[PDB]
């Protein structure tokens, strides 16, 4: 059980500097490097070995878990083109020529989206240097020249002088780039001395000029890789934040807050006032990882500011590439949909404009079948937008969305797309599913007996002639609003308390709807506290705030204001006692903040109930739509002070407030024949 | 200066059991008592001495400060009728007969209201026993038989058997009551054994049957009075509560809270579940003193409940007499106007019904000249209603009303009315005016230099290009809202703080009206805290709540809610620091109560501003009138929790909240050409 925990604990404590599926095509592009100091043949033989003893029994080259010839052709011939330059091991040269010479024909029947990074740029250059060698391939295919045609298209639309001004993907893909003057190509290089983190871009003229200032990049990625090499490295930021994101989406990272805070610290001290990149020192910035990092850094309590994201505004448009206008994919903006929800009054309206832009911009691929990514395959991203569009953060239960993601994690079944087909292993690891499944299932097993015991305690308590028609459809939802809110095992005291403290108030409120209200009171309710379980301080401190609640009941009996805020503060003061939650108020900001907090609580809770019945009839559109926006435009400040670390307050007590306000915000914008199947979907039918 | 303080301190520490102006008419009514144990003549000679050596040089009898023959005739002849029964001192018998025999003619030219307590009942009985004696008076006056006529009227309308069931004024006035069976007249007697606290009612047949169970009353009021005696005694409750009421109306009792709490304790332990009377054990209850005591006991923090006042409802009517329907006077209901304002949600609607009844019921004598009392003369009671009707407790500055009462206290110039003309000395004492005048005048002298210094500090602070047109008409009212709110000398720190902390917020709010709001901010205001005076903690704790205020400024910039509550809590947190006001929050009810308190603060402060501009135009009647009632119907709960002692909170901090909410409630319902002359009236022109 804890075996998986130890495995991932070591894996994250050993967070390294790169873990990529080893490529085979770039390996030859560097294997052509002559010996630097007047040698005889190749520079490294071990890569050549890894080349020979890593061919599929059928003779193909690439990944075995998937079949995609459009890339398999490059992977299967570029390995051979080196054994022609060095005349070694004629066994598998012609053993693979039998494959390629008869199976290089299915170019024009792949697909219309799955084109590689300049697949029309290097493939010619590949066959271009292969032309001089002893090659004999089926040159005459109409599918190939139909690709040469776009090569000549793209080699002209690119600039000449200004092309020496962008560090961009054209500098990432230099194989199909001939006659490149090197006078300016040296100053715009990677901070550690690489060519866009790729060695093939070096090996254009690196073949004889061994500039160490770029050669330690290569020799490092050779000697410590020990057999084969991918094309792009390092990616520390890329892999790191991508891990923690999905892991927080798993809901089991709580055991690893230490290493969490460590990688957050790395990214934090690695922040630039102009953007972010795949790695630590790359000055080529984009929008997507910058946004998701700005999001997650804030989400775990760090001092963030998004005004830099104004570097993508093209007459209202936005794109991933910097100053470059190419059709973005679904996720590089979907992340921004996720990241735009948590506005603060100090923020800039760019997030809003971007939100209304991207919302409709994705509403195209809402119903249409264009839900696919441009640079990766996915299991169910429509499943992700299915939740993202109809559920904001203000009603985003952090457990039902995990219940949804259990059908969205593929792992081995999905291969990521780069310059070549490759996977990761670090966070694309295949026991995260096993661990999250087991964790959620034991959670399931505990709530199954908790609701059982609550049922017995309830119908043995004569609380049925108080309330109303059907107690089952109320006990289940009441237990849900708590269990789906607080799921840990070490707070079952609060878990059982919230249920009963809501049930009692619900019963008496339903009684006051019946006999009319506080003036027609016939019995003394103050003693109903007795039959909740007994403790040392859980009982008296309970009854006193309970009498405060009844005080309010009597207080408004000739008014028009609702009862939301009082029962809300009832529940939170109940939790404060149900957790032994106390504080050194030796500092005046303590009450300063606690005051405004429970103030906003009643404020929003009463401002929503005026929409409750007005929507139960719908007597006006402008009014209801104004109520909702007025709710959220200060729900922001609520979340803000709940989720800013500048305070000296305990985190847990700051956040349990948001817990219940979110519970009620959810039950507000979900109708019963919407919420009904949610309990089934969560608890009833188990995984595995 | 403190001489008056010592005088009244002794006077109140020596709060006794009765202090009434000594009568002269009842003295003879008991002087006719024969010697009990077989004596010769009268029972006590010293009263007879006090009779002879207390005649005016002109020969009249009564008070010298006022002239009212309708009673002076009784006082001047009843003293003589005894010297006829005992044949002593023929000097002043005939020396007063020269007066009476020629001056007993002005009966029919007194007035139409100033009739004594059954003046038509005893005057006949007086001349009735005088008939048998050697008298020779001008019997033939048509004004006298015109009074005999109503005597025969009233002696028949009274019942026979049920007249033995009410302890009432008919039992108080027994002189004109002949042939009274004594079998039931003994069980309904005063608890100490008196006849409605009057000895003449005994001396009807007490002349020979010396029942000690009623005779110790007489002998006590003889031996320890030592010369003369009034008719009604004891009145401990009557005089006591009447004192503390007017003294609290003086605003100098603060030096005497000890004796205050002592008399409050006496009245408190002297409460009955059925009503109150003049004295401790009298079972004859009324409405007026019961109501004013229920008021003042609550006002100083004691556990009260008014449901008993349902014993006056006569088909909607109310009256002072119990089951008796006689036209009440102005004050016995005016007190209830004063007492009905401070409703609580737990209260009964009797106060409301009574309020709408008595409001219009007095609106008759609002303009009409019928503003006079039935049992007392007054200096200016129209001055009292002049304030009571147009100013509720919710806008009742406790210093402007004292400024008004300085012209309402007459003291010696006014004689109270009972069965005979008499005054008090205890609380109708003539240095209370001197003390209150001196106290208010030194208050005046201190604020005169305080505003002077504030003016210098302000125009030296460059706060003029912020704000608006005329700074004088704002500095004066700002200083007023504080000085008229807090007047003591030992809190000048808070006094000077409130002024500047309101001025700064006012200036920046007026700036935000100008440039549009928080989004068009051009400078950093957070540093404006520096130029208020510097201290150890008065500065930082100030700036932080100040930044909280600015936080709210930014928070609502796209909303429709007002700014009242935030600046209100600003001012109160400023006072909390300007008084070193701190608390042991080791108890959860501390924040429980402080939270709801500042919640109601913002609630009411924002619910009033929506009426502010809507009244500046008046675009609807029902809406504005609903806003005001909705304000007060929870202003009640505000005042309630502010003014209930069931809490463990400090009183001062509970009440400073009410202070400012009242300041703004006043400035709301007073228009500038109403408030303008108030500052003049208070401070500009001094007393003396």
Author numbering:
A (entry chain A), B (entry chain B): 80 to 767
Can you provide the manuscript's text about this entry?
The large superfamily of labdane-related diterpenoids is defined by the cyclization of linear geranylgeranyl pyrophosphate (GGPP), catalyzed by copalyl diphosphate synthases (CPSs) to form the basic decalin core, the copalyl diphosphates (CPPs). Here, we used X-ray crystallography and cryo-EM methods to describe different oligomeric structures of a syn-copalyl diphosphate synthase from Oryza sativa (OsCyc1), and provided a cryo-EM structure of OsCyc1D367A mutant in complex with the substrate GGPP. The structure of monomer OsCyc1 consists of an αβγ domain and a catalytic center located between the β and γ domains. OsCyc1 catalyzes GGPP to form syn-CPP, in which new bonds form between C6 and C11, as well as between C10 and C15.
To elucidate the oligomer states and the interaction mode of OsCyc1, we determined the cryo-EM structure of OsCyc1 and finally solved three OsCyc1 structures in dimer, tetramer and hexamer forms, at a resolution of 7.9 Å, 3.5 Å and 3.7 Å, respectively. The dimer is composed of protomer A and protomer B, and the dimerization interface involves their α domains. The interactions in the dimer assembly of protomers/chains A and B occur symmetrically in α domain helices α22, α23, α24 and α25. Residues S674 and E677 are both located in the original dimer interface and form hydrogen bonds. The S674A/E677A mutant form exhibited the highest relative enzyme activity, comparable to that of WT, and showed a lagging peak position in the size exclusion chromatograph, indicating that S674A/E677A is present in a state of lower oligomerization.
